[PDB]
Amino acid sequence: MDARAVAKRPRDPADEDNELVTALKAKREVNTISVRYLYHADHQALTARFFVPEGLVEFEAQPGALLIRMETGCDSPRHLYISLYLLGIRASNVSASTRCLLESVYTASAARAALQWLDLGPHLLHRRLETLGCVKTVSLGITSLLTCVMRGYLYNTLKTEVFALMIPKDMYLTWEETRGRLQYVYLIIVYDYDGPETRPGIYVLTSSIAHWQTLVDVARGKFARERCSFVNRRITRPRQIPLCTGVIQKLGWCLADDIHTSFLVHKELKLSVVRLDNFSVELGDFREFV
């Protein structure tokens, strides 16, 4: 060790040669490959690759959407990768027109099997689902390829353009009238226990609150009817074991000025969505509140 080496400025990947360039320099050999500059070299976002059947890809042909993994106990493919837009067809928090439109658009064979698996089991949606962040490419076919980010700023390969995330309008919820320049966005599931079925609601929530206790306080304040329904089913029907009138998962941080309202088109059908351009994904697990 020496003083000059310690004081010297940090190493510079910015202009130092890439490894393949170093090797080809060492032997003095040239391949036809444009070896010098490696794509995705500066990428910070963590990327995963997923294969999906052809039926589900609709509304993902437009880049940007939440990709959800759902479970099926059968021996044959145990997990199926579903989109948030399709998941709305099950929620009771969707207007009749939007649910009818989604039901008409997603009438491919594979989609209805996932809908059967969602409600053919005793367990609620909470235990069945898990979130995978945001999807950003298409390669169509009988089986299509998706690429998706799990800790990311959401961008094209050259970063020539930022990719937004779209949320359907009926699911979007806000609990404050004024927005601080930073606010987080969460996934919200609530259950109605008064009806015969355990009828689930699907929500997406933007809030300037980062601390769990106050967020849960506000959630229990707004969802009081659903909490009362949970208590009512617990008292009314013994030997039944209900749980977690609502669950929370943290999914995103975004700069509040970025939010816009936009329309989305596929199969020359028109959907209404809310849009977040300069979005980023931060992933936590599900958590329960009562």
């Binding site: 393949l20 036809t32 490959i33 444009s34 070896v35 490696l38 794509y39 995705h40 990428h43 390969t157």
Partner: protein, 49 residues
């Protein structure tokens, strides 16, 4: 013999060797230099060409 005379239908698959004919410069292919993309994992780094 029952009171019907059913007809059967079945498929057979063959393995064959082909000859494929074409004319001089009937199709043209336009290509660029191969471009390398990186995917980083701790124990092994992979590149796509």
């Amino acid at each position: 013999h029952p009171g019907f005379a059913l007809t059967a239908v079945r498929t057979d698959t063959f393995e064959v060797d082909m000859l494929l004919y074409s004319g001089k410069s009937c199709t043209s292919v336009i290509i660029n230099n191969p471009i390398v993309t990186k995917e980083e994992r701790d124990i092994s780094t992979t590149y796509h060409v």
